[PDB]
């Protein structure tokens, strides 16, 4: 309903389908730089149930829910309310999700996810990071057959593991 | 020497530095489609000993050697001389490098490396594939401490392993 007005504002070529570029330009990451294109790509492919390279209005109500939900999480854990998420808050956010990860390891996470290069993670980078972690966990989980947080794999199962990431 | 004439032909903006776009356009992959940009990016970052985003003439003599050498390998193993490399020939090429990999696993390799979508791997895709495999092997090797083609890793060492790929 109110969602239709949003859709019409975002669908700038009035095609009836919201493309990557369109969704990108309707989202801010709180740093006055374009929203992470990879993040946009992931959100599109998530809800696009055709091979459309975009989302229609029905699919878009899903996207709108997804982004709003990700905003709740991000604002909850950015408690000094700066707009970025820091080492401590990232530790909190992933701890809230159920990850049990060492403090130093969050050094790597920040280095890997933060496009801004400022020791902190923006909203767009934050979504991708979490998405990438779900994926790595899904894969790991296929190989940790007795569920004790350990895997023994051969060279070939490793390669096919890394290749099933994609 | 003769290399200088090549460099001048490739350096189209006459800057004295060969950019990504420039190198790309001076290379064919034998399929009348642009040479894999990722492949170009890798070759650049390999020989660029500044943070230049390109190569000067000195560095370029390295690149020229690297590409010619990769051409020898590719032509050796594309023995039906089509321009593509197939499952059997890929099996040969990597076997020549010292990889001991199962026949079915080469299904995954072709699916993963072939941008053309035709069950075969082009010259540009072939270089990247091999490069990606060297990297995965280097990493694996750091973790296979007793050198028997097996690793046991925890969840956190796995994440940091996958993250050291990049
Ligand atoms: Na296990
Ligand atoms: Na081992
Ligand atoms: Zn549109
Ligand atoms: Zn914060
Ligand atoms: Zn902060
Ligand atoms: Zn176990
Ligand atoms: Zn140039
Ligand atoms: Zn062939
Ligand atoms: Zn063939
Ligand atoms: Zn062992």
Curated annotation (Swiss-Prot), chains A, B:
Record GO terms (molecular function): calcium ion binding; calcium-dependent protein binding; identical protein binding; magnesium ion binding; protein dimerization activity; protein heterodimerization activity; protein homodimerization activity; protein-macromolecule adaptor activity
Binding locations of Ca(2+) 1: 11, 13, 15, 17, 22
Residue ranges annotated for the EF-hand domain, each copy included: 1-33, 34-64, 65-100, 101-136, 137-166
Effect of residue 67 to A: Does not affect interaction with SEC31A. Does not affect interaction with PDCD6IP
UniProt-listed InterPro entries: EF-hand-dom_pair, EF_Hand_1_Ca_BS, EF_hand_dom, Peflin/Sorcin_CaBP
Effect on the protein upon substituting residue 97 to A: Increases interaction with PDCD6IP and ANXA7. Impairs interaction with ANXA11. Augments stauroporine-induced cell death
GO cellular component: COPII vesicle coat; Cul3-RING ubiquitin ligase complex; cytoplasm; cytoplasmic vesicle; cytosol; endoplasmic reticulum; endoplasmic reticulum exit site; endoplasmic reticulum membrane
Principal location listed in the UniProt entry: endoplasmic reticulum
Outcome of mutating residue 97 to S: Increases interaction with PDCD6IP. Impairs interaction with ANAX7 and ANXA11
Gene3D superfamilies, sorted: EF-hand
Localization: Endoplasmic reticulum membrane; Cytoplasmic vesicle, COPII-coated vesicle membrane; Cytoplasm; Nucleus
Superkingdom in the source lineage: Eukaryota
Membrane topology listed for this record: Peripheral membrane protein
Swiss-Prot/TrEMBL domain comment: Interacts with different set of proteins thanks to 3 different hydrophobic pockets. Hydrophobic pockets 1 and 2, which mediate interaction with PDCD6IP, are largely formed by residues from EF-hand 3 (EF3) to 5 (EF5), as well as by Tyr-155 (EF5) of a dimerizing molecule (Pocket 1) and from EF-hand (EF2) to 4 (EF4) (Pocket 2). Hydrophobic pocket 3, which mediates interaction with SEC31A, is mainly formed by residues from EF-hand 1 (EF1) to 3 (EF3).
Function: Calcium sensor that plays a key role in processes such as endoplasmic reticulum (ER)-Golgi vesicular transport, endosomal biogenesis or membrane repair. Acts as an adapter that bridges unrelated proteins or stabilizes weak protein-protein complexes in response to calcium: calcium-binding triggers exposure of apolar surface, promoting interaction with different sets of proteins thanks to 3 different hydrophobic pockets, leading to translocation to membranes.
Descriptive protein name: Programmed cell death protein 6
Species assigned in the record: Homo sapiens
